[PDB]
Amino acid sequence: MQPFDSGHDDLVHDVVYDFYGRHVATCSSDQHIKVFKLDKDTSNWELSDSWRAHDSSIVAIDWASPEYGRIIASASYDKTVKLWEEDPDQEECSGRRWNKLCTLNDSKGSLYSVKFAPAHLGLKLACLGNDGILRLYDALEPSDLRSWTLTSEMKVLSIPPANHLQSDFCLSWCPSRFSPEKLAVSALEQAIIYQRGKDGKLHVAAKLPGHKSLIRSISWAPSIGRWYQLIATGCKDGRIRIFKITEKLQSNLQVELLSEHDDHNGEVWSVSWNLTGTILSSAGDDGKVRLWKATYSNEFKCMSVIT
Amino acid sequence: NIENLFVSSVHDTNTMYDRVATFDYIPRSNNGTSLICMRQSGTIYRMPISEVCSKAILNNRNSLLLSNFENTEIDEIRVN
Amino acid sequence: GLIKKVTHWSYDNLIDYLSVNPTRDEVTHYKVDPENESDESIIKLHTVKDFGSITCLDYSESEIGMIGVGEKNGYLRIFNIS
């Protein structure tokens, strides 16, 4: 359990792994993005580049698939989405290593979550903020990665939330190459699964019931090849809800709750899956990270607890 | 120059003993937080703020990465 | 407020004291030295808090530290300090 200091001057808001697992990018509240790499010799994380990205606190970053190159998204509270591509011929830890590409200003609200699409849908992207409007950005031109065109625009909430009331938004894509395109969208106390219809426009396909309070994290379990899909929900209650989605509007799909654990006694902040969807890591308000696995049954039981 | 404020996150902490009238912060090392509080009876005690994990991401190599709501450093649980 | 003087508990010349705050919330145990007039003789040893609203108190002379504490709700919380 060796710790490493990211060197930020403020809070760290989102940390994401890349596809290969040897790189992490750490956004923060001091408007900086620091990209760390794993040295194969020293076996320790070290900084690759640090640069000032936005004009407000950055709350969500996401790596793109390496078949599209080294692209890092960044959503922040200044209503901007900044896309960064790595220049191979540039000095380490200089600030000019990652070159700015686009600034999607189509959102009239402070954003919360940005999530790249899987590697079977294109170089798409998703955004959600305190405006109730879902925005999808496709990079339709492979020649230049700067003509990011908005293609879908679905409204999730009827009205934007109040200035003082707190609210959270999170996104999770479905990484199944052999299923219609789905998007798990969380807005306050609502979690909706969209689906790409035959007309090219997303429609409300299935709504996850429950969720008496704010939803802090949605993670779609990786489609390893099973006949059922899983969504992990970290609510503002103690509940780590796991939904069993079975698909059979191209195709109808049913939502069934698989498990509901009150084993944290507080707000569940982040819930996240493994590569194969076997280990579920849930972090809650008790200061402890609980791992979950399924043994001899479909219902998920608890495992090692890390404090 | 003018920044229109809005509430992002609300963190709830329960005190060690109930019936507290007023409290105060304590500036700690490595950006920590503790709360010195005075009760309704005038008794003064010290309530620490727990280090709540903000993000617990997994990995393809089965490595756990832990980020906190309080300090800067990031915890890593390798698989060896 | 109730200050109750307890004897037969200290082998030295000090005299043990049991104190209840005027809001009737805490029970505090003391050991007072008679030979020094200054306030440093009042040594605050122990404090047990959050006892609802205390309405009475007593002590057991047979064994040291057995301090019964009553409440308005009805619970006769009997415990030990020393």
From Swiss-Prot, chain A:
Q: Does the UniProt entry include the keyword Protein transport?
A: yes
Compartmental location = Nucleus, Nuclear pore complex; Nucleus membrane; Vacuole membrane
Q: Name one GO molecular function term.
A: structural constituent of nuclear pore
Q: Please list the residue ranges covered by the WD repeats.
A: 7-46, 53-94, 106-147, 153-192, 210-248, 263-302
Which terms in the GO cellular component ontology are assigned? nuclear envelope; nuclear membrane; nuclear pore; nuclear pore outer ring; Seh1-associated complex; vacuolar membrane
**Transport in keyword set:** yes
Instruction: Please give the family membership noted in the entry.
Output: Belongs to the WD repeat SEC13 family.
Described by its record, this protein's role is as follows: Functions as a component of the nuclear pore complex (NPC). NPC components, collectively referred to as nucleoporins (NUPs), can play the role of both NPC structural components and of docking or interaction partners for transiently associated nuclear transport factors. Involved in nuclear poly(A)+ RNA export and NPC biogenesis. It is also required for normal nuclear morphology. Component of the SEA complex which coats the vacuolar membrane and is involved in intracellular trafficking, autophagy, response to nitrogen starvation, and amino acid biogenesis.
Q: What else is known?
A: Present with 952 molecules/cell in log phase SD medium.
Q: What is this protein called?
A: Nucleoporin SEH1
This protein's gene is called SEH1
Swiss-Prot record, chain B:
To which protein family does this belong? Belongs to the WD repeat mio family.
Another remark in the UniProt entry says: Present with 184 molecules/cell in log phase SD medium.
Known role: Component of the SEA complex which coats the vacuolar membrane and is involved in intracellular trafficking, autophagy, response to nitrogen starvation, and amino acid biogenesis.
Q: Assembly and partners? A: Component of the SEA complex composed of at least IML1/SEA1, RTC1/SEA2, MTC5/SEA3, NPR2, NPR3, SEA4, SEC13 and SEH1.
UniProt name for this protein: SEH-associated protein 4
Subcellular localization is given as: Cytoplasm; Vacuole membrane
Swiss-Prot record, chain C:
Q: Give the location in the cell.
A: Cytoplasm; Vacuole membrane
Lineage top rank: taxon: Eukaryota
**WD repeats, residue ranges:** 49-82
How it assembles, according to the record, is: Component of the SEA complex composed of at least IML1/SEA1, RTC1/SEA2, MTC5/SEA3, NPR2, NPR3, SEA4, SEC13 and SEH1.
What task does this protein carry out? Component of the SEA complex which coats the vacuolar membrane and is involved in intracellular trafficking, autophagy, response to nitrogen starvation, and amino acid biogenesis.
**Its family?**
Belongs to the WD repeat mio family.
Additional notes on this entry = Present with 184 molecules/cell in log phase SD medium.
By what name is this protein known?
Answer: SEH-associated protein 4
Q: Which species is this UniProt entry from?
A: Saccharomyces cerevisiae (strain ATCC 204508 / S288c)
**Full protein stretch here:** 2 to 83 of 1038
